[PDB]
């Protein structure tokens, strides 16, 4: 079954690049659940996904 | 439907941290499909998943300029 239900479905492979030199924040979270409204950033939508499905997914956190 | 089938299912929420200071490469791919054998790194397993399911997932690429 699908992982990504709704993000950029016209794109055959969704890849996001992060320019580390330009990170504003000392802690930044990136989505690994494909539900975030701020994708590729994590907005906490994983929590709802985990509650609905019994899953245990969470973000990748970059630290300065 | 679950996204993560096999990674640390005993862990209530799988979170990975990257310290930017430790990134060795100019380009490093991190997994967003939960199929990589090198998770949290991407090993290209997303391509098999996309072919099998009709999905369109891919990695997060961290780009670091050569000093
Ligand atoms: S919103 Fe997707 S991992 Fe947090
Ligand atoms: S192996 Fe999961 S995004 Fe590449």
Description:
The structure is a homodimer. With 64 residues, chain A is α+β, with helices and mostly antiparallel strands. The first copy, chain A, has a single domain, classed as Ribosomal Protein L9, domain 1 (3-Layer(aba) Sandwich). In chain A, 14% of the residues lie in helices and 27% in strands. Chain A has one helix and three strands; from the N terminus they run ββαβ. The first copy, chain A, has a two-stranded antiparallel sheet with strand order 2-3. The longest helix of chain A is centred in the last third of the chain and has 9 residues, at 45-53. The radius of gyration of chain A is 13 Å and the shape is flat. Strand 1 (14-19) of chain A pairs parallel with strand 3 (57-63) of chain B. The complex binds FE2/S2 (inorganic) cluster (2 copies). One FE2/S2 (inorganic) cluster is lined by residues 31-33, 35-36, 42-46, 58-59 of chain B. Chain B: Residues 1-67 are cytoplasmic.
* Euclidean distance between termini CA atoms of chain A: 36 Å
**CATH superfamily label of chain A:** CDGSH iron-sulfur domain, mitoNEET-type
Strand tally of chain A: 3
Could you please say which CATH topology of chain A applies here? Ribosomal Protein L9, domain 1
Largest interface: A-B, 39 and 40 residues
Lateral arrangement of strands in the main beta sheet of chain A: 2-3
CATH C-level category of chain A: Alpha Beta
Q: Could you say which overall geometry of chain A the principal axes of the C-alpha atoms support? A: flat
What small molecules are bound in this structure?
Answer: FE2/S2 (inorganic) cluster
Name the quaternary structure: homodimer
Just name the CATH architecture of chain A. 3-Layer(aba) Sandwich
> What series of H and E elements makes up the topology of chain A?
EEHE
Residue share in helices of chain A? Answer: 10-25%
Secondary-structure-derived class of chain A = alpha+beta
CA radius of gyration of chain A: 13 Å
Largest beta-sheet details of chain A: 2 strands, antiparallel
Subunit structure (chain B): Homodimer. Interacts with BCL2; the interaction is direct and disrupted by BIK interaction with BCL2. Interacts with BCL2L1. Interacts with ITPR1.
Subcellular location (chain B): Endoplasmic reticulum membrane; Mitochondrion outer membrane
Cytoplasmic side (chain B): 1-67
Family (chain B): Belongs to the CISD protein family. CISD2 subfamily.
């Amino acid at each position: 079954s699908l992982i990504n239900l709704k993000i950029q479905k016209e794109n055959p492979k969704v890849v996001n690049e992060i320019n580390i030199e330009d990170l504003s924040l000392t802690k930044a979270a990136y989505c690994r659940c494909w539900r975030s409204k701020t994708f590729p950033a994590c907005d906490g939508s994983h929590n709802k996904h985990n509650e609905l499905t019994g899953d245990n997914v969470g973000p990748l956190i970059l630290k300065k």
